[PDB]
Amino acid sequence: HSDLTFCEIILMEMESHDAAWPFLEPVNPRLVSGYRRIIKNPMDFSTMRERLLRGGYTSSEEFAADALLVFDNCQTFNEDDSEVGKAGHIMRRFFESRWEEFY
Ligand SMILES: Cn1cc(C(=O)NCCCNC(=O)c2ccc(F)cc2)ccc1=O
Numbered sequence: 001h002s003d004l005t006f007c008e009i010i011l012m013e014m015e016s017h018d019a020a021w022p023f024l025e026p027v028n029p030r031l032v033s034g035y036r037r038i039i040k041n042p043m044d045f046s047t048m049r050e051r052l053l054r055g056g057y058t059s060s061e062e063f064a065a066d067a068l069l070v071f072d073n074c075q076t077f078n079e080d081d082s083e084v085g086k087a088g089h090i091m092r093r094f095f096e097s098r099w100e101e102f103y
Pocket of ligand 1: 021022023027031032073074077078084
């Protein structure tokens with residue numbers, strides 16, 4: 001239980017974060033030119049939320065894997081000085097920050 005409760009806390013704080021807007025819903029490939037070709041395994045906060053409520057997380061490790069997948073995708077597709085890039089850096093630093101002050 002207590003392993004996924006802090007996953008609920010982390011995901012809640014990330015969902016309500018100021019810099020969270022580029023990762024709340026899945027990237028719409030019809031809108032983002034080149035995203036389908038470059039990102040082979042897309043991930044966002046809503047998909048992690050769905051899988052968390054539906055229970056499909058065996059441990060905190062798969063959850064953390066999905067978050068790091070969000071930010072790996074962000075850094076793969078967007079420049080570090082793009083708006084999505086800067087947001088993604090703030091969100092990644094926030095996630096590792098809060099994740100480390102539990103484990
Ligand atoms: C995680 N992540 C998020 C985004 C992102 O959120 N991008 C803005 C949202 C798209 N929404 C639009 O409305 C739109 C799209 C294209 C256009 F030409 C005009 C408007 C992009 C790359 C990425 O890796």
